[PDB]
Amino acid sequence: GPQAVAKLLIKASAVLSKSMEAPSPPLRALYESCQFFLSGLERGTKRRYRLDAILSLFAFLGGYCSLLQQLRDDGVYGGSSKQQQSFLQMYFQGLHLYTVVVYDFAQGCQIVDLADLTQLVDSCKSTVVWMLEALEGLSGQELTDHMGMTASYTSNLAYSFYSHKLYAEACAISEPLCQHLGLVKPGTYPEVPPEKLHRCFRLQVESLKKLGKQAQGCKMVILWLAALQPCSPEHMAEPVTFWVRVKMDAARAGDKELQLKTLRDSLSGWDPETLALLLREELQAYKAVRADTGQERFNIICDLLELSPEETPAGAWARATHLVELAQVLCYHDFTQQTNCSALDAIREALQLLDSVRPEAQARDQLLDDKAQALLWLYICTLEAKMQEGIERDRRAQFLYSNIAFNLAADAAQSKCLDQALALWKELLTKGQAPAVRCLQQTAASLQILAALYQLVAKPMQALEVLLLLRIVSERLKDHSKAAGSSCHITQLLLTLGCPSYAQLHLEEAASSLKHLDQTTDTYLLLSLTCDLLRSQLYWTHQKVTKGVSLLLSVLRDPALQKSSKAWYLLRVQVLQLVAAYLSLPSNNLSHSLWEQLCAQGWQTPEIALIDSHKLLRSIILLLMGSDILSTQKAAVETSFLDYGENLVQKWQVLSEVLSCSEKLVCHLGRLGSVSEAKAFCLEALKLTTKLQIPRQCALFLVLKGELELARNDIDLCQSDLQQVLFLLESCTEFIPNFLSHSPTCDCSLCASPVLTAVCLRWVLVTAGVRLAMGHQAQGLDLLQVVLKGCPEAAERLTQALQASLNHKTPPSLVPSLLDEILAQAYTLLALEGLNQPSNESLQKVLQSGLKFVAARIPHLEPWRASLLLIWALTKLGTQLFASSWGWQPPTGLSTLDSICDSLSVAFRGISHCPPSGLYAHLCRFLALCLGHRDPYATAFLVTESVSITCRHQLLTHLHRQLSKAQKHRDVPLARIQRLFSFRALESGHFPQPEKESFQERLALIPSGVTVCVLALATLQPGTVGNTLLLTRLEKDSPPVSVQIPTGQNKLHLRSVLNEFDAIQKAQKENSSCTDKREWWTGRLALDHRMEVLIASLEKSVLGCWKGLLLPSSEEPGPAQEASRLQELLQDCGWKYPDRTLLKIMLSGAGALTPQDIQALAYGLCPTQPERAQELLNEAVGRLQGLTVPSNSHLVLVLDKDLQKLPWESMPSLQALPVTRLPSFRFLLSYSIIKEYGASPVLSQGVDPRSTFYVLNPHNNLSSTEEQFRANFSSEAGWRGVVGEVPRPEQVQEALTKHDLYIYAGHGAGARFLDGQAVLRLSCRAVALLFGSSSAALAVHGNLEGAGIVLKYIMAGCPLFLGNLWDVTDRDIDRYTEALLQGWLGAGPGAPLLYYVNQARQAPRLKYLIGAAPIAYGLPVSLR
Amino acid sequence: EFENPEVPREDQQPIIEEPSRLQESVMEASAMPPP
């Protein structure tokens, strides 16, 4: 009660007043005071009081302590020192009570009450002073221990004030105690528990730290150092950490006075050994902290080196260690000028001193650790020098030469160093005893760096050994974060090698270690997400996709993944790689719902996710080490590395991950047929490997590049790359090729390394491909058998070596699945060669062996399984089995055809999600042949889905960037085009149900008055050109019409036409260099006549009667009625598959139906009664002659990689029609979508003739062209451009984007100043009139699809692209350009360009050699 | 008749996205306990 407490306080005050007036000893009062104290103790349970009450209690307590001291002083207790000691214990009891009261009041104290708490703090300071004053004179451990209890009580009260922000008051209370402890002599208080002293100093130091009195607090740290004078430096390791934190605050604030005061300057007279130990601890604490601490560490090492006496052997060891630290500092900072010694010189001197030192049988462990660290940092610094010299060499050069000069004795020497460091650390740590090192945290950090180095140089096994040692250290250190991280690293590495069981065990170990960590720290979130990612990967490997996808979706949806740290960025890379791994799976694996959920995250194609992973990795490289290691630009950037332990590991880890991601990108893109991008990534990786000087990765990427060059059919460059690989391998083993003919068990650098074995096997595979390409059979076959024999042996050696490394008893359940792709490719090549040789039964057995091999591994080796199924179907094929499935012919799985259809369906759904460019076309066209008119919609869909697949992949990737860049800036049309081009927009069902409704929707999207005709060649032996033409006509509100034209049985087959076209081009090349004028013109005339005959053959023999499937359908009802009658009338004459839509299209052109066409149509469509069918067809034509009238529509030609070369627009039937070309039907749909959303102004409004940019004679090689076009182009209104000079790229970008027309009269397609990437990086709003040579030509290299700049223009959104199909001369093309421009521009508004294109085709002298060259890509355009 | 020969119009002499800028590590808050 307040009044009651006041009355009690009044009683205490009155008692004190009476005691003051009491001269006679108040011994009885002291006894009464003890009773009052007892009452307070009983009330102490409650611990509730006001502030004046607490103040009055303090006053009464003061009198009690005074009486206790007075009694102790009085001879009564003066002689009875035990009574004086008991009096001291009584005062101590009062002190304990005071401490309890203060804690209770402080806890109850509110923010506002702090003012009274400050008054209480003043009393507490006086109490602490009284306690220390009483402590004075104490003798004996118990007396000093009692003094320690007084300090501990004060420390408890001090924390209360510290928490109450009364840091000044808290520091003041601690100051007296701390001052006494700081100024106390050594060994005065040996008993006092150090942690108690730490607590007391901690509060004051932190207070002095937070208050900003860092200077003042630093001095108390010296008193803190002085207080623990006899205490071991292990206790002193807390002041050291506190000190560096104090100095860091000065560094952040820019204060220099604190940095001036160092340890040698501070103590100035401690013993050299302890002073050096404290300097070492300070250096360790600095190396633990982040930010740039180069100069501070340099100063600490300088004083350490000064201390170490070189004459004394122990001083020699100390100097060796300090020289290692100095090498670490100099190895990333430009401090050589002050020290006049390079990092390499310091490390070599340190290594010499270490070799001189002999251990004392108790410091042998630290000797091992120091030698290992010195070797590792020697390697690191020499590698840094090599990288710097590589950057300088590439800067001066700013290829193919350094690539073969990597292996030098330096690599053997540089590596030996790393293996010696690993052996030393393994010897130190593998024994049971805990290593007796100074900082086991440095053994841990250096082991991490060594593992990163081993992974970077492509030695994963030694990295696994290092990580096991790191796990041992972390278990010994009782640090669970490091244990979990090391276990995650081991699991990821083991998954990369291909062993899932050991990965599962180490993932369980990681989770078990993860349970210990606090579930709030960021490290816990990192490790938990990493563990979930590894579990997702393991499920993906163990065919548990459903559960695995859920984990991935949980990982991706976790907001913690998008934090701003380098560890999170590295985690996201693996998330994207796992997304790619899941997206590479067929559709049968996961449900549609989960497929949509996975694709809704932002990545559609595996190549997209892998490219995003590559970009993130390079971004991390930029953030960590700058851009010198990636780009060789002169002084690109100079970001400091900022080495703080984790940065050093992350540098090497990111470099290794960039190399690995570049391998997956190259392999995946080359597998799909996209060889240009694959070569770009392969060359970027080779450049990186050249800078880093790593022969192993250079050999691997050189083999990949050789494979790509074989794919592009460039044997010379491929053989050059293979020779470089052979030199690198023969140098690596030293420091028919001889690396073959080895025992199944061997330990040569090549045999003990899985990476080198893979490189050798891939080399053998590519050499076999070259021999097969160069016509050398019986040798490529032998190399393929070598690969077949070698892959299982390498797998068994990898299994045995992993078993030896990880020390398990149970061998892995399955051999690592890392050479499965190589073996499957070898099987594919062997079966494909066996196709050519049906006589040899061995390859027939190889087909089945490969089929079992790929079927035993589902769904991993799906593309190779699809290839083997296609080859099996082709083998079962051997006038055809497809004749029964088509309505027109030239004039156990049930049956064979059904089994072929089932196998091809399995192959299709095995590759449909991410199809290779060639295999997809092969399967689609073969399946269309097998199906025919049995499933017309399926046949039409298959024929549509076999043209421009690489263009589809490139458009998907381009749409991702357009979406990513828009998201960065901030999309509906882009999403719709993505859905249109996606391989995963299908529903769930059996083939072809899902594929059909999709194609039916696409057909329903056709624009009105447009005919889409797809001309594809069916190939019965991949790598060749077939003689069967597949024609599919698509029109709105009309069922698709498909036909097959076998041209092989008759003379003049489509292959002969292609050969003649190639011969014409070759002869033109040769004739272009003739100096004579009378021979040049004769050759040109002969070639023109040959090409005219070729076009006539195209119209007459290649197509035949089926030339009317490309003409507009009649809008008059006559053909409809005639077809309606003739369907029923011809079903009786032997027409197996009646089609009204076919008859309607063919009869719409009854005027041009020659009697030979009618004869062929009747004799093929109705073979049982040919004469009668001919009679009815003739009667129908007679009724429809004249009655039909020409329509007004447009034709789009979709041709495969072999048919774009031929000039189809120049045929007599098509010479009076608007005909354009498009890569695919999906592109016409995309044009419709873009026009709907108003993103194509030219296709919507029209070309404005006042907006034209012209490039005329850039390099001044042509004078007739300039003299013919300069005045005409300049005189036009509103036309700008260049003439006589090359145009700047930012000019031509504006020309394409901000202009309606773009005329180019020069050499080629202008690729020198307008590359494909440049145009693809912008939106095309102009009609590109490229009048160069081969401007609209697609270069077909090998079996790859055609490549050219026209595809870039179309994917950029160009309305129409006009270009020449073959090389042209100058004067004739000048004539054609003049005619076209005059006719189109003088025709007034609303003039279609295609009509005048075909009209100006009659302008050149060589009508067919020059005029037939121009073609059109896109949609018709007209002026506004 | 035969005119002079005509000179040919032939010339006769994939981008890896530039690395993006990743944000720097977020300085994590540096815990004084009771007696």
Ligand SMILES: [Zn+2]
């Ligand atoms: Zn060997």
